[PDB]
Chain A
């Protein structure tokens, strides 16, 4: 077979842990626990081929900045997440996450992922964001950010609904096995 190291990064609470646990266990975490680091594995059929994924969960908090970058050596692909329901986490892709992974792993492919798409049209989220003068990220905005940071692709998912999660990691594999110029 063939293994691939995939690290998932992004702001605290954007949904990194639920993404990974849903993908690898088909269960949605019952309780939020801050991540320190976690190494998961998956074997996935991707375009008729069986691939091993060596998956890493990271702490998004600035408190663990140095710890997180110790997980980056030998990474083959980064999945950078922002929450569709938190525009500040989108801006931190531009200001923190994309520059940090490129600083540590020059030219390593990046998949951009908008999480929690089930919240985009939820009235309560819409009302809470409106009190902050905000609105959920649109798919076109997600594409525009992917273009800006030279991500291989923008994808959206809801780990809670188990909607689009499989496709994120299949595209991560393709970024390593079928490099695009």
Chain B
């Protein structure tokens, strides 16, 4: 019942680049978060990218599940499925 945190700490990997440790503003759209992540790696066209769990689940992160991310979760930048 208690509400989720409005800020969460995560690490994001992008194969071949150095990883990014950041705090996600959960009130900011996920697309803006991805744009910030992409900007750091000299990547444009952020709407062609997605965040997905780096661990064995490999679930994609969405607006509807981003509330379930705990502090310390490792994510991977990837191409959006669709």
Contacts and interface: CB of A to CB of B under 8 A. Distances in A.
Interface residues of A, number: 12
A67 B74 contact: yes
Most buried by B among A64, A66, A67, A73: A67
B72 A59 contact: yes
Interface string B9-35: 101010000110100000000000000
A26 interface: no
Given A67-B11, A70-B11, A70-B13, A36 B19 contact: no
Given A36-B9, A37-B9, A67-B11, A73 B19 contact: yes
A74 B21 CA distance: 13
A41 interface: no
26 contacts: A36-B9, A36-B71, A36-B72, A37-B9, A37-B11, A37-B21, A37-B72, A39-B21, A59-B72, A63-B72, A64-B72, A66-B74, A67-B11, A67-B72, A67-B74, A70-B11, A70-B13, A70-B19, A70-B21, A70-B74, A71-B11, A71-B19, A71-B21, A73-B18, A73-B19, A74-B18
Q: List the 10 closest A-B pairs by CB distance, nearest first.
A: A70-B19, A70-B11, A36-B9, A73-B18, A36-B71, A36-B72, A37-B21, A67-B72, A67-B11, A64-B72
Interface of B: 9, 11, 13, 18-19, 21, 71-72, 74
